[PDB]
């Protein structure tokens, strides 16, 4: 009893690739196959799922309207059609025998990696904003940081004020530039790798998610906020 | 197995004497683990004493227990009429409980 | 703190018997509990003994092959079963707390009288 | 049927009080008399009992070996005497009859307030520490606010490292001179009522808890801390 | 340059205790020498100073009229003695060299931990009123809870109406019995650890704290209040 | 049903210590009564029991000779003489009441800590070696690290030799100073708070553990070891 | 130049032994001399110093007030009395030269053990938990292990919790019975040399150390301890 | 039953030695007694024998002559007394009970470590 | 002068495994009068297996000696971690008792 998996590969983003699973030892037309996958480093994951001719094709709400689930019983062949193929496929894909209770996935196919990448990566230069979290009163000091792993060239680096449902709004930029409008108790500073938003005394309306934003080069990235509640 | 010997097998008193019971085992009694109980006609067992000279809670002074090792003793003190009854010493120090014969106080 | 006693009567050589022991008043599931008799006009005797899980169960030597004790914790009840009953098994049987150097038999049942006779 | 109640007022720490309660409309010698107490803005709370001839009488864990409860039947007189008054004994106190099974506590006295303090103020220089928490990387830099109520005269304001068991480590001292040991890492500043120190480049030895001190006057203060985690 | 201390330990309220701190390494008959204490997961906490004969000797607040600080330059020692001690008391205590400009507390004691408990525990029934604040209009339906951390016996569970500047009054007593005199509209239920205070109809009247109360045992514990707003 | 303890505190080495804790709610002169200790962020340790008077009292291997255990049952008081004491006793000490088979140790005092110590507020200087361990061959370098939580005055940091079941051979002194009969394969550098020992080929008889040690102050500390295997 | 080193053994606890150590090759009457130990499988520790006369002679905490050193420099000899010994002085003793600049610890005696020991050559029941740490949600299940060395007589097993800076609370006893007031989700079971502590669905305040303990002989054990987050 | 050693340590060759073992537990008297050593990193190695008064005590070849097993049953007390020591003798000591056909070296001491260095 | 012979002088195996230790003497032990010690380091030895085959009391059931004669046998069917130390055979058959060379087990 047996599962011969071909198939995958590495291919870009929105992209297709067709799996196959051979299978022998057992009447595969009457058995229902299973696709499953498993993320790197992450849990499996039920995909899809084939069975008699006269039952319904069932998908997971992630694939379903990209993915198709099919099988050729004069072949004794599964196959999983994947278009729009997003990074977010990135897995392991394995075909299985459904047994249910006889046995649940007791026949899985060895895997084979399916991996959609565009050629990362890379060279962008990671921001990393600390603390996560400040938890401050009005009228005391908030410091925020901004580190990066590459140096800045010209300083080309902005920070942004967010309240929720609206858009951000542009507080510094050229690291020490304090945009039109912005009251003068924000102020940045900083060089290189180390760069620094400073609320001087808070007031009540400054109580938001904060970004900085390196626009250095082609690759434009953002650290991932400090929330000042 | 450890045999407890009661004497005297029957006490005839008059009420405010004192009763003197001796309970003898065959072998020492480890950690002193005896314990004497009263029973009057048809009612279960009563603890008095316990750890050889333990007083239960609500038993009266006037019960007293001692001794260690072979030879242990009961006293009351002045006898009332509702202590005329029959009276058990017990050892728990093996795995293989045993009581005395009893000593009828009359 | 009182234990409720159940069972009993007249029974045939060779019959059979359940004593119960409702107990109430205190950690019933983690107590040493013992059954004792006493034949007419005889002195008290250690019958059986059952405590925690993982702890042996104990019988004299009389009753060992015949008399069964056990526990149901959950209803706070001690039982004795008592097989293969003759005439010596006549007696009154009590079930007692038994609380070792804290008060030996501190806790006694009222007592059940079991009459082995044809 | 009621409980007059007497005494208390304002005393100073290691005093001493007696506070009395007079029934009237009850048998009082057959009663069990309590003292309940509740602290300022706080909930009630039990104090002591006491009962029949043959009294078994009882505290709370905080007052034993401080109050004594006591009553004179013949005057129809309930008593607490207090001795070794502090900060933390300073309630309203109420004498109750308990009921028990027939009533819990159905008679109250109107309460008497028991104030224990050495003067009114707490007139001392307040020092804010910002934030209380930070959660940082090593490498990263901490910057710890210390704002003041007043003016801090001479800049004399002090920081010190706490480890976790350990005593508190000197770090800087007259606002911003180094003690003697400290790396280069550790710098404070500011002057009047805003000093900062600031670890410029967080080493795994650096988590701890750091407290600002003023000694510009006769009344030491301390930060309540910042943690750096 | 050291400070050795001996001393502290766990005493019992009301008890007396005396530090010890020997100096070594510097005069110490010229020095300004402090006392600080921290209780546990608290801050930093000034004592007590001395200082040079013709100098004054300052006392915190809380511990004037208890505390006693000394010194013996003879043999370098310095004392501090504690009477009439409290849970408030319970600390690591601290002795310190006090350099002022030169360097604030620069030298410090390891310190002594001081407990001040008659008990140790704990064991009491717990009782929790939820929610803490209900805002609720006239003619609502207030329901409290009261849970018990074990079984309250008997039900023998109160509950208390207090108004500001009032003593408590009796609602319900046995968990289900209305106080002589108690509107209809309040109604007390449950058993074991759950109970219940059912306030019908909200009066304007019935606007204000409710406290639940167990006394099934010798140690009397009240819930921390429900406030009706 | 409770244990009050008191006593302890911070002691001399050498010194002498009574520790005591007093039972009410039982019968205190039946049951058996052990003291219990734990060393800061260790485990629990048995120290000494008692019994009735028909009994012996049994100590630790860690406490035999020096502690004595005792009790006066007309105070329902149990006792620790501590004599002797040293740096290893320093832990939080426990009276506890043991039941055996009817409940081990079902009853505990609060506890009171035990520190002997006859040092200052500063720590000793702290010597890591890393890496614990390296396994290397015949021929290869290997490159063991010292590092001290204080400068090390005048390079005063030496590095030994051991072999298993052999004392302690010098081979660096001064940081970097050959011992007499030393391989000039083995050569120490660094300053301050960074200390290398290099073997530059490592032959079979170099397989030992290496230890660092300064020797800077009164106070001699040695690392912890790195093993060559 | 040569350290004769002689004496050690095995020694009762409470006992006295007296360590020798015989130089030549050097001027003994200058030299200063300094004891280390070092416990079966441990590192390196100062014990004791002695030098001209002059000077101080200087003591680890570890052994201050029990031990001696002393020298008889007309028969170039370094002694050591060591009293009222205790097993965590059980250790290999060496004498050594101490050069500071000019060789540190350069001469070694060849080191003498000393063992402090009352028991035979059984050893003591070994309680081994597992594992050593639990990260674990509220309401999800803890599965704590007890492995005995030898089997625990009679089931004669117990359990504790206990909270950071609380005395440990009996949660079972005789391995499967749980004390009064314990809520149900805790059970005991196992036998012999296998036991498990199951909590069935955590609740927030079940988050401490559990430490498993056997009494079924006269030298009671505990295991290590598990800590469950 | 328990063997409590003691002795052992650092001597000098030529120097002399008196290892302990005090047996608790059982009947001392009766029992047949062995010193066995254990040279570091090597095997085991039986020393010498004593039984009852009358019976022969016995030596290994390397120690007969320097050696002398005894006895104290009033103190229920073993000895070895070890002369003329060389740094051959340099072993781990232990004594133990021997119990033959019912149990061999069934109860050993914990060993004390005798070193002979100059 | 019997001597005793054991191999292999080292077994590296792995925790499940079966170690199987050999025993062999120069002359027949009389009565199979020998015995099995297991050492671990720093600790004294302790009995495992005597009289040939008897497996001490508290010993687990893992351990079990064979043979007769002058070959003989100790196996552990299913070694666990705590069973990684050196194995010593004994023989007491005569007035001077000797020992095998010993078995690591690692």
């Given at each position: ?43 499996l ?12 094709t069932y ?7 990209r ?5 050729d ?10 278009n729009?193929?997003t ?22 196919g ?15 230069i ?32 902005a ?51 904060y ?7 082609i ?8 929330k000042?509640? | ?17 004192r009763?003197?019971?001796?309970c003898?085992?065959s ?17 279960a067992?009563?603890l008095l ?27 009351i ?10 009276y ?10 045993t ?8 | ?67 069964t ?13 008592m ?11 009590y ?12 806790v ?11």
């Amino acid at each position: 009893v047996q599962l011969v998996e071909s198939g995958g590969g590495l291919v870009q983003p929105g992209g297709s690739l067709r799996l196959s699973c051979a299978a022998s030892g057992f009447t595969f037309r009457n058995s229902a196959m299973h696709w499953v996958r498993q993320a790197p480093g992450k849990g499996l994951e039920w995909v899809s799922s084939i069975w008699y001719s006269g039952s319904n094709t069932y998908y997971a709400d992630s694939v379903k309207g990209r993915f198709t689930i099919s099988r050729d019983n004069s072949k004794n062949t599964l196959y999983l059609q994947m278009n729009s193929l997003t990074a977010e496929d990135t897995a392991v894909y394995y075909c299985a025998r459904f047994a249910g209770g006889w046995g649940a996935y007791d026949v899985w196919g060895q895997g084979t990696l399916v991996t959609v990448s565009s050629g990362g990566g890379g060279s962008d230069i990671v921001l990393t904003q600390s603390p996560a979290t400040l938890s401050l009163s009005p009228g005391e000091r908030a410091t925020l940081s901004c580190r990066a792993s590459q140096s800045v060239s010209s300083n080309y680096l902005a920070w942004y004020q967010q309240k929720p449902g609206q858009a951000p709004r542009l507080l510094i930029y050229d690291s020490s530039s304090r945009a039109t409008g912005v009251p003068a108790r924000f102020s940045g500073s900083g060089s290189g790798t180390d760069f620094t938003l400073t609320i001087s005394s808070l007031e009540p309306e400054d109580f938001a998610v904060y970004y900085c934003h390196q626009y250095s080069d082609i690759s434009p990235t953002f650290g991932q906020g400090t929330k000042v509640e | 197995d450890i045999v407890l010997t009661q004497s005297p097998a029957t006490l005839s008193l008059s009420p405010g004497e004192r009763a003197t019971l001796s309970c003898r085992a065959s072998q020492s009694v480890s950690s002193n683990y005896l314990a004497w109980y009263q029973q009057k006609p048809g009612q279960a067992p009563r603890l008095l004493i316990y750890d050889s000279s333990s007083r239960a809670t609500g038993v009266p002074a006037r019960f007293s227990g001692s001794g260690s090792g072979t030879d242990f003793t009961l006293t009351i003190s002045s006898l009332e009429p509702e202590d005329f009854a029959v009276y058990y010493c017990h050892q728990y120090s093996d795995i293989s409980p045993t009581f005395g014969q009893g000593t009828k106080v009359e | 703190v009182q234990l409720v006693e159940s069972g009993g009567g007249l029974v045939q050589p060779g019959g059979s018997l359940r004593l119960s022991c409702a107990a109430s008043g205190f950690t019933f599931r983690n107590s040493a509990m013992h059954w004792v008799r006493q034949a007419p006009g005889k002195g008290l005797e250690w019958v059986s003994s059952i405590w925690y899980s993982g702890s042996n169960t104990y019988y004299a030597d009389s009753v060992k092959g015949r008399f069964t004790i056990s526990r149901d914790n959950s209803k706070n009840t001690l039982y004795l079963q008592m097989n293969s009953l003759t005439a010596e098994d006549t007696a009154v049987y009590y079930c007692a707390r038994f609380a070792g150097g804290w008060g030996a038999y501190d806790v006694w049942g009222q007592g059940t009288l079991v009459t082995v006779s044809s």
